[PDB]
Amino acid sequence: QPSTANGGFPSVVVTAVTATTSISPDIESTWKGLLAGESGIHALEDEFVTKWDLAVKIGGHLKDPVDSHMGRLDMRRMSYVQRMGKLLGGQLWESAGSPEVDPDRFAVVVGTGLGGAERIVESYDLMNAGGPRKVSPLAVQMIMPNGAAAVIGLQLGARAGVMTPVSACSSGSEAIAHAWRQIVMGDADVAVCGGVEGPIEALPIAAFSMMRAMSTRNDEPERASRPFDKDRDGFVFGEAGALMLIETEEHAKARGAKPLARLLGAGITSDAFHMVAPAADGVRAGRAMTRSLELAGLSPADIDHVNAHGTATPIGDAAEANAIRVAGCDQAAVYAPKSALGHSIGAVGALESVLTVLTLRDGVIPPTLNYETPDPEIDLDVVAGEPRYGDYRYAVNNSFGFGGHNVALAFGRY
Amino acid sequence: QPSTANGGFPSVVVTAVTATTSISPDIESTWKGLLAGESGIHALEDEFVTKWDLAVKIGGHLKDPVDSHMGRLDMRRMSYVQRMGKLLGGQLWESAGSPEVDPDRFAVVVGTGLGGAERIVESYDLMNAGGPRKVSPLAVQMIMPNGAAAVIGLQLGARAGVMTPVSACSSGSEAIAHAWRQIVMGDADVAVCGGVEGPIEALPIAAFSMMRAMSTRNDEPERASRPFDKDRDGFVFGEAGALMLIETEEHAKARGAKPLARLLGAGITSDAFHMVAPAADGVRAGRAMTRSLELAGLSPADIDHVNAHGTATPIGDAAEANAIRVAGCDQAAVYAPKSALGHSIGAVGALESVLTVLTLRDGVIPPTLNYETPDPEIDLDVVAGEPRYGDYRYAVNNSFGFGGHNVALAFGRY
Ligand SMILES: [Cl-]
Ligand SMILES: [Cl-]
Ligand code: NA
Ligand code: NA
């Protein structure tokens, strides 16, 4: 049985990371802000909040809007997530030293949750005004959900596959999983992978608010997202996009790249329980964690840290606590970054994978914000109050998305 | 180096197939119709054709509309592709003998190209009339593009992963590729996989017509789709959805299932050349074919049959001819089923994978319709005139989708 530990899979390392968040456009500044206890969540100033008198009046827009970096041409021929992908793809490649890699061994896997939905809705209009020949001959390349991965693959020259997984909140983690598979099966030696997602808008707020999935603690926006806290009342949206560069350790060594961490294994399972709610028993979600350990060659006792999915919904956090127990990982130090960064559906698993890498690199876990009253049904070791410095050797990042899509990624310190 | 031939990968067999097409809701009736030279392509009677005076006035609607099988409840809580997935998923399971499988070893991978786009556009309206609290609390489960795979996984009880790849015309083939990977890596023993796509509508016709990608031979609808013919003038839309059941040969034998064919290997590459046009040299597309042979343990000389992507665009067919040469497969007997069934983006690679299986099972390739004048730049052995009966031992199904996403699937006779 091949595993990373027994050499049956090639060693795969993370060599570069990039992200834009509600705290900062600079991932190292986001990290410093997280360690300092900062929140990206604020009162929403968007006109659509007062227009609709939305029950949710809080969220985290990007600190640095993507389109402040976009000229008129890009604004007209790319969807938002394509522009985000172009921005992050170029930043990542620069952070990696702009390496010259073999295109035929270079893959791109970028997930999204909702996708380029704004250009589809926009293409109807204009046609209803000027007919079919009005429709921008660029419409096809802006409307389909693989558009962001396609842009990045074309931008960076990836000819070993350009893939887009769609699994709601787990899309960005699942993308990293498939990139890892593409390398360990021998199809690629290097891959850009992660997730992108559109900005906070009225329709997603209304759709998820109508499920009672979202916090309405509008008076104290920074205190609203309370993963695993007894007083939690749902998730908060916080915008993000994130990409990482992974490659075989041999490929990194050959080009002088310094690894930030090891990507050791990935598990993908499904609840087949409900179209939006997670299974209360946490069993299939825990088994995604177990599968990542099997492929890494690790035991539950090796796992020092879990970067929780931790959305702060009542049922979601309870399910994940059961999952962590099922996987034998309930002695791990737990961080719930959505406490500070909010939920970004298709991007957030990639963002949290980057955070897991930084936790292993720096030996420190930021505090879970607003964790003030342990929930009795949640008996987890949640890092809180101030950063916990620790000898974290191995970690699992969880992403358990709406629909029961479970992705767990196993990382190790380099 | 593991291969299927050397036992490094477990043997994987196709045990059941289902499809709905412009010829028939019954895959075996579609097959008989193809062999008889039937076309699913007709004059479009939709009001939107005359409303917009579209340049394209032809296409193939499903012979049996999905919603003729859908009650009021399903019509209101599922997107079209979710309803198609539910219909095909139930038909497939019945054709397989309704087996009781281990949920924890059962995966679902279903691709789509455009997805549940109609429910997103629909959710804006109603909110603009009655506000956020009007928005159907079922909106979330109807709007995201993983919705069809989620429905099928919940319907059939798949707990070893529920995945949705998005790669335009290659999505349905890529789904089968990822399902094969999920089994040969040990994550599942059985998987339902394929692709689904919405019906012919005005906006897709206008978007692809504006690229000059579509035939306008409106006077003779059945003669319009002419893959590899000198007089071809673009593709024709033909609706479809298709799923197959794959499982380890040991799993099939244990439950008494009779395999229809073997799924031996899958290659996924990318052109990184252009956002919609394929690379003229066919090199990366050919390498997807080569990769499928490497993983199967086959040589180009083993390939008796290629089920071409064959859209009938001028540049697409020329690129694919180069790809088949690059892969060393230009002595294979070539079929282009879009000649009779048209193009169904996210579903069509799955449909053509089913057809490849039937070709191997029955030792016969249907005629490529409208192939009357070989193109000098296309020197391929295209089956035409009447079905060619032959000793087909191994075959490759190609899907080379817009954006340069190349998927090749290697199948063998059982
Ligand atoms: Cl602590
Ligand atoms: Cl012939
Ligand atoms: Na996480
Ligand atoms: Na084909």
Numbering used by the authors:
A (entry chain A), B (entry chain A): 3 to 416
Q: What sentences appear in the manuscript?
A:
We also determined the crystal structure of apo-KasA, which was refined to 1.80-Å resolution using crystallization conditions similar to those used to crystallize KasA-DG167. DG167 binding stabilizes the KasA acyl channel flaps that are otherwise disordered in the absence of PL or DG167.
The mycobacterial cell wall is adorned with essential mycolic acids, which are synthesized by a fatty acid synthase-II (FAS-II) system that is absent in humans. The FAS-II complex includes one operon that encodes the β-ketoacyl-ACP synthases KasA and KasB and the acyl-carrier protein (AcpM) and a second operon that encodes the ketoreductase (MabA) and the enoyl reductase (InhA). This complex carries out cyclic elongation of short-chain fatty acids to produce long-chain meromycolic acids (C48 to C64) that are condensed with C26 fatty acids to yield branched mycolic acids by Pks13 (11, 16). KasA has also been shown to be essential and a vulnerable target in mycobacteria.
